[PDB]
Amino acid sequence: GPQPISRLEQCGINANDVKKLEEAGFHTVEAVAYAPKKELINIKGISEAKADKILAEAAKLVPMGFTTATEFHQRRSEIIQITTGSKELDKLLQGGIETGSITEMFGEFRTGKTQICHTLAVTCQLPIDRGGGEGKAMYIDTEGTFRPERLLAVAERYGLSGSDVLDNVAYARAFNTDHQTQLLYQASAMMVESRYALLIVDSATALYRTDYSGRGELSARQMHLARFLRMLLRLADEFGVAVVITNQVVAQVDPKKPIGGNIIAHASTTRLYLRKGRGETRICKIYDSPCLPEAEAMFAINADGVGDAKD
Amino acid sequence: GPQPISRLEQCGINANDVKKLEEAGFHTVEAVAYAPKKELINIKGISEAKADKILAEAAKLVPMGFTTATEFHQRRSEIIQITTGSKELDKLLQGGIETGSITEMFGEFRTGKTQICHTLAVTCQLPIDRGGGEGKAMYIDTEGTFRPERLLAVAERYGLSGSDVLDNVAYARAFNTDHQTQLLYQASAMMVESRYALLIVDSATALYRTDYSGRGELSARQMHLARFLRMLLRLADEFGVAVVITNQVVAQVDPKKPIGGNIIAHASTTRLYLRKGRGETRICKIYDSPCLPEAEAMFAINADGVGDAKD
Amino acid sequence: GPQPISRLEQCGINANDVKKLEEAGFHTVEAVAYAPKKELINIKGISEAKADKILAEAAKLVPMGFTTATEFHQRRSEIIQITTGSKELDKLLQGGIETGSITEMFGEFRTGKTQICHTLAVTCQLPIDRGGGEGKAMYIDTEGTFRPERLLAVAERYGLSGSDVLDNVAYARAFNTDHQTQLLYQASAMMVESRYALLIVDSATALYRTDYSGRGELSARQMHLARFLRMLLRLADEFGVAVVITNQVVAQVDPKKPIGGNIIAHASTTRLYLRKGRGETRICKIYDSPCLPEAEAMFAINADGVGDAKD
Amino acid sequence: GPQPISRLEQCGINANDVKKLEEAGFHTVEAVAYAPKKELINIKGISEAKADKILAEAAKLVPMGFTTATEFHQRRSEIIQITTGSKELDKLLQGGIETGSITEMFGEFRTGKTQICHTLAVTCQLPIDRGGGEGKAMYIDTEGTFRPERLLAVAERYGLSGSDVLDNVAYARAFNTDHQTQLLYQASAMMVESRYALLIVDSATALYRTDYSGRGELSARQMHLARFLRMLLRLADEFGVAVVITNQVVAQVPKKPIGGNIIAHASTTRLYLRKGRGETRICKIYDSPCLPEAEAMFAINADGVGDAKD
Amino acid sequence: GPQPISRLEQCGINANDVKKLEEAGFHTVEAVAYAPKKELINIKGISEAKADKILAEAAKLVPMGFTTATEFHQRRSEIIQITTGSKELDKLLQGGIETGSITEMFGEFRTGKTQICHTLAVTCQLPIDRGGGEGKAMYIDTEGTFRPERLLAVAERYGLSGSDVLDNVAYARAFNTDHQTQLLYQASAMMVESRYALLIVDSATALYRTDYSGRGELSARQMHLARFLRMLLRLADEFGVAVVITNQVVAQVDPKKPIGGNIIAHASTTRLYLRKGRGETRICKIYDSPCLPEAEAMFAINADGVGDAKD
Amino acid sequence: GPQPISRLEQCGINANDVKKLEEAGFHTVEAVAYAPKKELINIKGISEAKADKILAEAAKLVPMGFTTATEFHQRRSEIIQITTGSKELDKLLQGGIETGSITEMFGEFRTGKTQICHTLAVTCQLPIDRGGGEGKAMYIDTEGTFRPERLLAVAERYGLSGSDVLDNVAYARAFNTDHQTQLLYQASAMMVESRYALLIVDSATALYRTDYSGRGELSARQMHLARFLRMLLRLADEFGVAVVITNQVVAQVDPKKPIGGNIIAHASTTRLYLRKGRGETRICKIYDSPCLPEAEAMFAINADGVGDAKD
DNA sequence: CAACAACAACAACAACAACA
Ligand SMILES: Nc1ncnc2c1ncn2[C@@H]1O[C@H](COP(=O)(O)OP(=O)(O)OP(=O)(O)O)[C@@H](O)[C@H]1O
Ligand SMILES: Nc1ncnc2c1ncn2[C@@H]1O[C@H](COP(=O)(O)OP(=O)(O)OP(=O)(O)O)[C@@H](O)[C@H]1O
Ligand SMILES: Nc1ncnc2c1ncn2[C@@H]1O[C@H](COP(=O)(O)OP(=O)(O)OP(=O)(O)O)[C@@H](O)[C@H]1O
Ligand SMILES: Nc1ncnc2c1ncn2[C@@H]1O[C@H](COP(=O)(O)OP(=O)(O)OP(=O)(O)O)[C@@H](O)[C@H]1O
Ligand SMILES: Nc1ncnc2c1ncn2[C@@H]1O[C@H](COP(=O)(O)OP(=O)(O)OP(=O)(O)O)[C@@H](O)[C@H]1O
Ligand SMILES: [K+]
Ligand SMILES: [K+]
Ligand SMILES: [Mg+2]
Ligand SMILES: [Mg+2]
Ligand SMILES: [Mg+2]
Ligand SMILES: [Mg+2]
Ligand SMILES: [Mg+2]
Ligand SMILES: [Mg+2]
């Protein structure tokens, strides 16, 4: 995977500066390479010449130049995709949930976003030949609606051992936006040691509705949301982990629209809209995607996770 | 239960600051740890560095990091469930009413929400081996429809002493939304000294239909409801008290929909829909739940509380 | 019982604000302690700080905290119930007509709601040891069907002097919904001087059928009805009077359903359904009650008021 | 009795506004006092402040406050009742037809409804000494069965002059369920210009069966009937006149009055007429807040209505 | 094409000076000619007389005097335009995308900016008689939204060799504003060696929203944006490449406006506004242009790229 | 017109001195007369006595003493004014664009300053009886926004031949502030040979925004702008040509302010402010003028140049 | 004494009989 920051120690860099970078949140040389000069200067005790030298030596460790489109196509041909637990949804997504990007599913209440998140979290531990990502998973839950019983049910359905799928899922709760960002920081610190494949944030904008209320607090809310989404995107680009976030809806009074403004719209790569059907059936539609045609699919949440409709 | 806020005094914090935090609403380390920096800053006489130290020591007191899913499963397997008073409904709920969450029962009038609330209030004092929670009950009532006669009848049915049942139930009445929020603040203040198991708000969204009228003040109504539900969620996560709220319905002109909107749709954890059949028989259906299948059950309200329908 | 606004003057407030509140409609410290901040702010000439100050002093005047259920039981056991003039109906209601809660009686035409209202108005003047409270009565009549000869007949049946029986009965006909609300305002203003025990509104929703017509203005009609019922409930709670209202019915076109929608259903406390029987006899059924079991009784209307059927 | 609306002109309201109100239909201060603010707003050119000011002044004009049951008892004892021409029916109703209220008479066809209406119309001209309010009658006839010959017969029976009896009877006919409302609107000016003691509608619900048909037009029919009955009640309460209306009957698949709950709840007194043997009929009180449920016997003689000749 | 800077060497200037100028970014005589004195002085190792001599030779090599308008008209008539992929859009721009200038397309999310950029990138390699520019395309992408599949689809639609169109497209990703600005130096370095006819930046102002947050950082953000746009304009004037930049949108909040401010408004030459209508159809409008009227052409994005709407 | 510098030689001045003056930038006797002693002594090879003789002879050639105000009034009535292409705007300016003075237009983007400049450039060549200046015109453009198509359209509107009108719009482009300033020397050199009546510069302060950045470079920027404006004023007073300049705008975060500071405010004589109205209609408001009062006017840029608004 | 823009969100209200 990514080269740890210890390599920078072998480039004429003092140990205390490396420790300062590590405690600032840059646990990988990729983070320092992608860091602008302002971020590397805002940390106290760092001089302009020191930051210039650090960036100069970090630029040699990772390629940041011009490459032909054929090389990019070859690189994209090795992108792992994780099955969503339904054959129809897998066909609709043309492979499944993509890694290295942000895919957000939004809809009304009880539509089935959390069930999909649970099924993805338990599925990503599967071997690659079976459609998994062959890695652990993380769940930063903000609504307190994490139920390991569903994970056990899906593990029983797929035949895996429940103990292992339980032991290979990190969990955390967010009580406020600041705690959410600190959880992202701790996830960045932790991910450098083991192999992670999924990172679920359900839901990303639940706490922003209550913490930032009113009109005069709109700009600060948008700035904080933008910083959070930028951190998520940086983590996805660095560690190559599939980031799945959940979004709510709001009324179109005088008819529902996803919340979060233009920041969430321009920060996501794939967007899915989930809507209610009849009894236990739900409909998924590709709201926005750079290479996926606008289509629809039908699914249902059975007693063993998400799957195809029992028609 | 939660550690009292006085422990913060043993972490180099002035007594007057702790008194200010207590008068602001925070009476435990958990409440302070769950609050963002904005809320603490909003208190007058509090500096930025002092607040940062306060949250630092609060986070040191109570863990907030990542834990394996098996630890969460072990924690969840030791959660008390309060019997609803009916065996069929107990089977439907897979244990009864769960603590630490929000259960909202809604339906038309005459369905039996108040009777269910009364039965839960009386039976939450039972020993754990009988399905109780072994704690005092609270009743914040807004419609002026609290009758101790039903509590006496259920106490006679289960055989406990009526005097102790009446003595171990706190009651209060709400005349407007502001008084409802102040009652919640007083409940937070008084819950830290004794052990409480249930907290009933019937109805949660009854006054909001009258105080806020018209399209002009819809946003203010939604914001106030969101703040009230956030306070309820904070109380539930703090003291581990089973919160039961009651909701009404509205007619779908051009056919009944629960009032409150997306705020109460997303704030609640478990939702039950109660409908009227014939005679004294009623039908309860699980509307929204993260780990409970959509099913139905039949019950009735006899002379001694809610129970199974006579066949 | 109620404490006039004058007591606020000795608590720090001046006289101009007291006069302004009296103009607004609050003639009691209880009535001003039951109002939200937005209601007092709407009175022009009152500042936010002044409103907070007066609300704090009013909350200091009357208790609004948490009380044990045993205290509520003691308070509830000392309320007065007024007999309806029939032994069967008195047994059915387990005491008669309560005070402090809304009792709605509905049925088809010719059924006999107005006779019951007249008999209750006469009985409202009986000594407390004979079946009724000790106070005067009112009659807001919106159909022009107030017949004093029935009052004289019932007073002769029980045995009283007709002069003071008729003297202690207010009356005011209503010609429109706005006039009805202004009549309620005048009743609230005038109730503080003397002792009142019955507030009859017959019919409560008779003018709403004609004043508001069509689907377009249904929401405004419902909002106005909700405001009227909220004012009625506030008056009943503040002055401790027995409010009795009458309601009409409509045919359930593909069979009688009371009019008023969910507002009247959720605003009332005791609902009775009166139905024509055979000849002169009628049957009264408990439609809805939080503590009275669903039963029915048999009665009639003789030449001297309502009473038990003669067999 | 009623105070002309011109008074409102003198207290600070433009004459144009008073003329507009008179055009709308409010010919009396009482008429504009009994109307809600919403109704007054619907008139174009009337502002919120102007409507509030005129409503407040009108409320200052009329005593809309709270009274005592003794005063209402004195007011009730000061009303007049009009004899129906039969002693049995006179004693059945404890007098006659009370003014300021609505009396609906219904039954099967050919049961002496129009005969009773004619006798009541001719009786209201009597001096108070022998019943009647000493006024003039109005006949809004919808069925077309108004014969100006029974009136002469009853006038001859009572000894009154025929020409004066026939002179003061304002007759009009309605052809659909839109001319009735316009006739009622026009009746306000005639009632404010001269004393009127009886308004007769026969039948109240006759054209509604044919103009409105099917389930689709049921709601509109009920709304229009409610508006018509509300206007009738407003006129009765305003001008202190007695309204007598005639209602048809419908079979049951066993006869019940038509009109639904609207006419049942909008009528104060209800009488049911049934046929017996020969030329004898029975009148029974259906719904009444004070009169007990009883029956009386009456016959339609060759001269007028009255007690049966036995 | 542009004359390489080596022609200066045989003009009286030292080769070391030419190398020093080369490392600064001036790889062409045109770049040195279009340079103020301070720009050529701030580079170390350059004297005043030496800079004056270099500027004198640069002015001698490149004509900078007045010219009759007919010659400019002829030169404008010899300007190549790149087919946009739609016939009505080609009619809208009176040809295609102009070369030697800056065109900026902006709109809300999922409106078709990236699809248009991809279609232009593949179309630029067409022979000059089919509307192409007969060169190579460069793609600087700042959102990770480059998909070679769309390029392959459009190449198959136009009957090209997919391998060649993949081999003749250069790609780069910008992880921060500094990297985005520094990519242009490499772009200029690699543009002289071969023939390039299209440079796409998508998006130009995406990273400035998050990197430069708050209010105190507004002036620095505007200065950096101005420098970046000036460098883009210098590239366009130097190598005669069609520069296509992408711009986002922002809400007004007491209704959407492009971001960037007056700098982007005045720097760009042609401005296009793209909006979404119904289904798969979009509307394109001309916002700012010196010689094109305000029209509202209409198009769509099918599986083979941009194209005409299907009725 | 102005007397050429070929008159000081036949007065006792060596031809070498005249050649030196011509090289320095002074091509007419008036330019040397207006040159102060400090400016002329800066020329290499010029002594104090030679300079004194030169200024003495120049002052002898052209009068510089006091003139009675009626002579100035007579000379003021012999000033040509150029029509702006709109009759209403011509009425607003009371004749048109005055010669021998500096006019400035500023506004937001797409407001229509370049269109007005093009219309003035093409109409300047009209005969005097039609409102033209009878002379040629020039165009020093900095943004590369010169489009001969608009000139051809207006020439078609006025009926003049396209080739003849194109052959007299000698145009140049400025790539930096130094080049923009040095273009004026060539403009003065070519102005003495033919008849010119326009010196359009669009825009004057475009390059100064990016060439000079930061607070440290403010004083040098202001000094250079002052020198450029002084050269423009000297040219206008020398050759009697109408100088028209275009100014950008900036926002007011603490709302539009023309850029350039007090130097351009105190240098320009007539300042007009252009604003965007609705659709194709624009509003022109006179900002600053010592002769005409503040007023507003309406115009529109149709498909064939600027003109009156379409009604 | 000069110069620099940006940020969305919130649901609710029932009613009308008739035909051998
Ligand atoms: N064991 C189960 N078997 C079948 N269906 C289930 C089961 N558990 C939950 N469900 C279904 O899950 C649905 C709700 O899904 P989920 O909790 O994921 O909603 P969500 O919209 O993502 O939640 P939220 O927005 O409130 O966070 C319910 O309608 C219910 O039918
Ligand atoms: N002692 C009793 N015995 C039997 N049934 C009873 C008794 N007391 C109340 N009920 C029943 O309670 C029912 C009403 O239920 P409940 O009082 O809980 O109201 P609810 O549906 O919660 O309505 P709301 O709170 O909106 O007024 C009635 O139908 C009545 O039959
Ligand atoms: N003096 C009396 N003696 C006996 N019965 C009487 C007497 N007065 C009225 N009634 C009875 O009253 C009954 C009607 O009751 P009431 O006047 O209270 O009507 P209501 O249905 O409440 O009125 P509404 O629906 O029109 O508002 C009639 O059936 C009649 O028999
Ligand atoms: N001159 C008369 N002498 C005796 N009886 C008469 C005379 N004129 C009419 N009648 C009687 O009048 C009765 C009909 O009464 P009336 O004309 O009032 O009908 P109605 O019940 O009002 O019916 P409709 O529904 O047609 O209005 C007949 O039975 C007839 O015997
Ligand atoms: N293969 C495809 N077939 C049809 N339409 C497609 C296909 N791929 C993407 N789309 C369409 O592309 C649209 C989004 O356009 P695009 O990807 O160019 O985004 P954009 O608005 O320019 O945003 P951004 O700059 O954030 O990428 C979607 O609405 C979708 O309908
Ligand atoms: K939920
Ligand atoms: K000036
Ligand atoms: Mg969920
Ligand atoms: Mg209840
Ligand atoms: Mg009644
Ligand atoms: Mg008739
Ligand atoms: Mg894009
Ligand atoms: Mg321009």
* CATH classification of the domain holding C21: 1.10.150.20
Helix count (H) and strand count (E) of chain D? 14, 14
* CATH classification of the domain holding A268: 3.40.50.300
Look at the alpha carbons of D96, D99, D100, D105 in this order and tell me if their dihedral is positive or negative.
Answer: positive
Chain centroid to Cα D139, Å, comes to 10
F272 - beta bridge partners? F105, F286
Same domain, C196 and C252: yes
The residue whose CB lies within 8 Å of the most ligand 1 atoms, and thus the one to mutate among A113, A146, A245, is A113
Distance of alpha carbon D117 from alpha carbon D148, whole angstroms: 12
Distance of alpha carbon B90 from alpha carbon B82, whole angstroms: 9
User: What's the domain range around F17?
Assistant: 1-73
Looking at beta carbons, which residues of chain B come within 8 Å of A139? Answer: 69
Same domain, A13 and A139: no
**Beta-sheet strands, E only, within C25-112:** 67-68, 102-107
Distance of alpha carbon D111 from alpha carbon D300, whole angstroms: 9
C-beta of residue D135 within 8 angstroms of C-beta of residue D125: yes
| Peptide bond before residue F6 is cis, with ω within 30 degrees of 0 | no
Structure tokens at B29: 């380390």
Nearest C-alpha neighbor of C270 from the set C129, C150, C102: C102
Q: CA–C1' distance D87–G14 (Å)?
A: 48
Terminal-residue alpha carbon distance, chain A: 43
Distance of alpha carbon F100 from alpha carbon C201, whole angstroms: 91
- Phi, psi angle pair for F7, to nearest 5°: -135, -25
Same domain, D179 and D66: no
Contacts of E220 (CB under 8 A, 6+ apart): E212
Chain centroid to Cα F236, Å, comes to 6
Chain centroid to Cα D256, Å, comes to 22
Q: CA–C1' distance E40–G2 (Å)?
A: 25
Same domain, B134 and B228: yes
Helix (H, G, I), strand (E, B) or coil at B45: coil
Same domain, C68 and C198: no
Contacts of C147 (CB under 8 A, 6+ apart): C118, D76, D289, D290
C-beta of residue A139 within 8 angstroms of C-beta of residue A170: yes
Distance D93 CA to ligand 3 centre (A): 14
Helix (H, G, I), strand (E, B) or coil at C221: helix
> Which residue places its CA closest to the C1' of nucleotide G2?
F261
Distance of alpha carbon A46 from alpha carbon A41, whole angstroms: 6
- DSSP secondary structure string, B109-178? TTSSHHHHHHHHHHHTTS-GGGT---SEEEEEESSS---HHHHHHHHHHHT--HHHHHHTEEEEE-SSHH
CB of B262 sitting under 6 A from ligand 1: no
Contacts of B36 (CB under 8 A, 6+ apart): A176, A177, A178, A179, A211
| Peptide bond before residue B213 is cis, with ω within 30 degrees of 0 | no
Looking from the CA of residue D109, the nearest atom of ligand 4 is 25
Distance E13 CA to ligand 5 centre (A): 52
Fill in the amino acid letter for A61: L
Helix (H, G, I), strand (E, B) or coil at B241: coil
* Cβ <8 Å between E69 and F249: no
C-beta of residue E310 within 8 angstroms of C-beta of residue E300: yes
Last residue of a domain, one of D21, D43, D73: D73
Distance of alpha carbon B51 from alpha carbon B24, whole angstroms: 14
Q: CA–C1' distance A264–G9 (Å)?
A: 15
Distance D114 CA to ligand 11 centre (A): 4
Q: Is C110 on the interface with D (CB under 8 A)?
A: yes
Q: Is F230 left (phi over 0), alpha (psi -120 to 50) or beta?
A: alpha
Terminal-residue alpha carbon distance, chain B: 44
C-beta of residue D114 within 8 angstroms of C-beta of residue D74: no
Same domain, A289 and A195: yes
Helix (H, G, I), strand (E, B) or coil at B282: strand
Nearest C-alpha neighbor of F200 from the set F135, F250, F296: F135
Method: cryo-EM
Fill in the amino acid letter for E31: A
| Peptide bond before residue B203 is cis, with ω within 30 degrees of 0 | yes
Which of E37, E227, E293 is facing F210, going by the closest CB pair? E227
Strands A102-107 and A242-247: parallel
Q: Which ligand is nearest to the CA of A303?
A: 1
Strand G nucleotides, any atom under 7 Å to a protein CB: 1-20
Structure tokens at A294: 């606008």
C-beta of residue F279 within 8 angstroms of C-beta of residue F309: no
**Beta-sheet strands, E only, within chain C:** 67-68, 102-107, 136-141, 170-173, 196-202, 242-247, 249-251, 256-258, 270-276, 281-288, 296-302, 305-307
Nucleotide nearest to D248 (CA to C1'): G18
Same domain, A138 and A261: yes
* Cβ <8 Å between E144 and A101: yes
Distance of alpha carbon F273 from alpha carbon F287, whole angstroms: 6
Pocket of ligand 3 (CB under 6 A): C 109-115, 143, 203, 301, 303; D 265, 287-293
**Local structure of residue F204 (DSSP, 8 states):** S
Q: Is E51 left (phi over 0), alpha (psi -120 to 50) or beta?
A: alpha
Distance of alpha carbon B166 from alpha carbon C70, whole angstroms: 5
Which of C66, C73, C227 is facing B186, going by the closest CB pair? C66
Q: Which ligand is nearest to the CA of F103?
A: 7
3-state secondary structure B194-225: CCEEEEEEECCCCCHHHHCCCCCCHHHHHHHH
Distance of alpha carbon F137 from alpha carbon F201, whole angstroms: 11
CA distance C155 to chain D (A): 14
Strands A169-173 and B67-68: antiparallel
Same domain, B184 and B277: yes
Contacts of C287 (CB under 8 A, 6+ apart): C106, C271, C272, C273
CA distance B118 to chain A (A): 27
Looking from the CA of residue C288, the nearest atom of ligand 2 is 28
Task: Give Dmax (Cα) for chain C.
Answer: 68
Distance of alpha carbon C64 from alpha carbon B174, whole angstroms: 8
Looking at beta carbons, which residues of chain B come within 8 Å of A253? Answer: 215, 218
Which of B148, B178, B209 is facing C36, going by the closest CB pair? B178
Looking at beta carbons, which residues of chain A come within 8 Å of E146? Answer: 72
- DSSP secondary structure string, D101-144? SEEEEEESSSSSHHHHHHHHHHHTTS-GGGSS-S-EEEEEESSS
Distance of alpha carbon D197 from alpha carbon D125, whole angstroms: 8
Q: Which residue is associated with the tokens 């405004």?
A: C220
Structure tokens at D265: 């709840």
| Interface size between C and D, measured as CB pairs under 8 A | 91
* Cβ <8 Å between B288 and A170: no
Structure tokens at F190: 């070519």
Q: CA–C1' distance C69–G12 (Å)?
A: 36
| Helix or strand (DSSP H, E) at E105 | strand E102-107
Fill in the amino acid letter for C149: E
Same domain, A38 and A81: no
The CA angle B187-B192-B193, to the nearest 5 degrees, is 110
Contacts of C117 (CB under 8 A, 6+ apart): C139, C200, C202, C244, C246
CB atoms within 10 A of CB A253: 9
Last residue of a domain, one of E23, E53, E73: E73
**Cα separation values, A274 from A81, A104, B267, E276, F166, Å:** 20, 11, 19, 21, 63
What is the resolution in angstroms?
A: 3.3
Distance of alpha carbon C15 from alpha carbon B224, whole angstroms: 33
- DSSP secondary structure string, chain A? -PPBTHHHHTTT--HHHHHHHHHHT--BHHHHHH--HHHHHHSTT--HHHHHHHHHHHHHHS--S-EEHHHHHHHHTT--EE--S-HHHHHHHTSSEESSSEEEEEESTTSSHHHHHHHHHHHTTS-GGGT--SSEEEEEESSS---HHHHHHHHHHHT--HHHHHHTEEEEE-SSHHHHHHHHHHHHHHHTTS-EEEEEEETTTHHHHHHS-SSTTHHHHHHHHHHHHHHHHHHHHHH--EEEEEE-EEE----EEESSHHHHHHH-SEEEEEEE-STTEEEEEEEE-SSS-S-EEEEEEETTEEE----
Strands E305-307 and E298-302: antiparallel
Same domain, E127 and E137: yes
The residue whose CB lies within 8 Å of the most ligand 4 atoms, and thus the one to mutate among D115, D279, D281, D282, is D115
Distance of alpha carbon C179 from alpha carbon C186, whole angstroms: 10
CB of C44 sitting under 6 A from ligand 2: no
The residue whose CB lies within 8 Å of the most ligand 4 atoms, and thus the one to mutate among D84, D108, D113, is D113
Determine which residue's CA is closest to atom 5 belonging to ligand 4.
D302
Helix count (H) and strand count (E) of chain B? 13, 14
Fill in the amino acid letter for E247: N
Same domain, C116 and C135: yes
% helix, strand, coil for chain D, step of 5: 40, 20, 35
How many CA atoms are closer than 13 Å to the CA of B50, on its beta-carbon side?
A: 18
Q: CA–C1' distance C217–G14 (Å)?
A: 11
Fill in the amino acid letter for B176: N
With CA atoms as reference, the chain E residue closest to A265 would be: E109
Last residue of a domain, one of F73, F103, F128: F73
Neighbours of chain F (3+ CB pairs under 8 A): E
Q: Is C292 on the interface with D (CB under 8 A)?
A: no
| Peptide bond before residue E219 is cis, with ω within 30 degrees of 0 | no
Q: Which ligand is nearest to the CA of C274?
A: 3
Same domain, F95 and F222: yes
Q: Is C191 left (phi over 0), alpha (psi -120 to 50) or beta?
A: alpha
**Annotated binding residue B111:** yes
Structural domain total, chain E: 2
